[PDB]
């Protein structure tokens, strides 16, 4: 037992991080098969950050401007395009450790883990969601442009992430692996607000369950609601709106722990309206939403 | 910017990791150079573990006996020994992924990452703390054993940790990779209570440079402090007592920030007497222990 916030494996991952130069700019890439993926914005200067216009500077880059190193080794550019905010750098080489992989686009309220890398070189691993509003809540200094998020299923990797942008709150931006943004973000250097940041219920009550099977219940109590009920409730705690494909997801644990989703809802409702009273649940003082009820499943079951 | 409970990346340990089978018991094994090196309780039922009599139970163990599979290939076993609470299995071949690696008995209050494994197979990566107490908050459900804690110091892997125990309390116990316990620990289905957990107050103070950095401020305050005055605090709070040379190590914080050791310490003081009022530090709603000062110039200035 014990619960935490748990990346992948990065390995299949760090194999496949490169370091790509543009000029004087340095960011990282990832190196699948004979193709590496980098933020297209590896062609800009910050001073053409401002309002790039990445069809034209691109005309002015030839494959050999683009410096491609694995580790020590260079590798030789036989072609490159840009695909929506990504730039694909055709390599005469495919990449030895390049895992079985997927690129997919996750949707809100979805988790996957973060390979924050400087200069081609991975630097720690972390666990992430997608929030609401399309950002996520990362760790990326200057030369992190280029890190990837990414799930494992066995052996295959499924990429969705590569970040590109921090926003001037502090929040983070970033793109699928075929270069389009998460939410209304542009790899520009200007404000974009991003919208409320809602709590991702199905998360926090898929939480809850974990709380359950490891021990933390001072939360349980007599009471039940309907998903109308709760929702009035979620509506004023900025909460995302429950709805049966929801219930439907948390099912197993229910199933488990023999406490019915609408009896979660009810532990959840007084939560909200009473707060913890100086109490905690797994080790955190807040409701935590970030573990989907699959990452609940996965831990609490051991799935490698 | 951004603050995260970051792991190290995996990778170099994922690449050692094997399954120790011994009768009808399977754990986790590190496989480095030519050994292999796993819990000493691989060789016992549950029914033996009441009270084992290791060196009475390896005498019945042949090195045919201990059967080691690296994902799907089997290692020949050519040697066996017992070294404190570990298994050392000489192999035939040495590991060819085994990284440049150190094995250190880390202090209480020191960090580090765990590769939790199930049959050999990375499930997942974390950061952890090795207790005041000498446990640890981890996630090890059954077959966990043989798991490693480690650091990594650019291309050189420090394993600290090997997971042996969870204890009726569900936190965890296990060795250094000499298989000498952390605490007071034995190998035996017995009730043994952990001592006092207190909370790493230099953790605490590198955690509240790692806010102000990234831009949470509310907590510093007009007040100073002195190591006495501090401690007097620390002791009603059961925080470990500040000494010299916690104030030392948060030297370049203190540079970094220009806020002077003592002031930060008055701020904890204020947030110890006063809690945090419904408000939030770096996403968490209690005082983080878990990052130690070396953590956070690492994570603040993006070493790989
Ligand atoms: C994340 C990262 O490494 N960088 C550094 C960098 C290098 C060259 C050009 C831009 C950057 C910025 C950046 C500024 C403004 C907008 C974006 C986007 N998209 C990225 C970030
Ligand atoms: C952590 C783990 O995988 N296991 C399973 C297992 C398998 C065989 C023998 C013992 C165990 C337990 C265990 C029980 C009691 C004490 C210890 C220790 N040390 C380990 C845990």
């Given at each position: 037992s014990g619960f935490r916030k748990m990346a992948f494996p990065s390995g299949k991952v760090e194999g496949c991080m490169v370091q790509v130069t543009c000029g004087t700019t340095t960011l990282n890439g990832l190196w699948l098969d004979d193709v590496v993926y980098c933020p297209r914005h590896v062609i800009c200067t910050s001073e053409d950050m401002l309002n790039p216009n990445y069809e034209d500077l691109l005309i002015r880059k030839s494959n050999h401007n683009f410096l491609v190193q694995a580790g020590n080794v260079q590798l030789r550019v036989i072609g490159h395009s840009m695909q929506n905010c990504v730039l694909k750098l055709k390599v005469d080489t495919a990449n030895p450790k390049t895992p079985k992989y997927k690129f997919v686009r996750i949707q809100p309220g979805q988790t996957f883990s973060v390979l924050a890398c400087?200069?081609?070189?991975?630097?720690?691993?972390?666990?992430?969601?997608?929030?609401?509003?399309?950002?996520?809540?990362?760790?990326?200094?200057?030369?992190?442009?280029?890190?990837?998020?990414?799930?494992?299923?066995?052996?295959?990797?499924?990429?969705?992430?590569?970040?590109?942008?921090?926003?001037?709150?502090?929040?983070?931006?970033?793109?699928?692996?075929?270069?389009?943004?998460?939410?209304?973000?542009?790899?520009?250097?200007?404000?974009?607000?991003?919208?409320?940041?809602?709590?991702i219920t199905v998360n926090v009550?898929?939480?809850?369950?974990?709380?359950?099977?490891?021990?933390?219940?001072?939360?349980?109590?007599?009471?039940?609601?309907?998903?109308?009920?709760?929702?009035?409730?979620?509506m004023k705690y900025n909460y995302e709106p429950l709805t049966q494909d929801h219930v439907d997801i948390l099912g197993p644990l229910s199933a488990q722990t023999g406490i019915a989703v609408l009896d979660m809802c009810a532990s959840l409702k007084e939560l909200l309206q009473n707060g913890?009273?100086?109490?905690?649940?797994?080790?955190?003082?807040?409701?935590?939403?970030?573990?989907?009820?699959?990452?609940?499943?996965?831990?609490?079951?051991?799935?490698?």
């Open positions: 400087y200069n081609g070189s991975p630097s720690g691993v972390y666990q992430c969601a997608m929030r609401p509003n399309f950002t996520i809540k990362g760790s990326f200094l200057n030369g992190s442009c280029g890190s990837v998020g990414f799930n494992i299923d066995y052996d295959c990797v499924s990429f969705c992430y590569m970040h590109h942008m921090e926003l001037p709150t502090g929040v983070h931006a970033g793109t699928d692996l075929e270069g389009n943004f998460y939410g209304p973000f542009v790899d520009r250097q200007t404000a974009q607000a991003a919208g409320t940041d809602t709590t009550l898929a939480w809850l369950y974990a709380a359950v099977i490891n021990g933390d219940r001072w939360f349980l109590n007599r009471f039940t609601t309907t998903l109308n009920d709760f929702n009035l409730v979620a913890m009273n100086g109490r905690t649940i797994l080790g955190s003082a807040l409701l935590e939403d970030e573990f989907t009820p699959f990452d609940v499943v996965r831990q609490c079951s051991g799935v490698t």
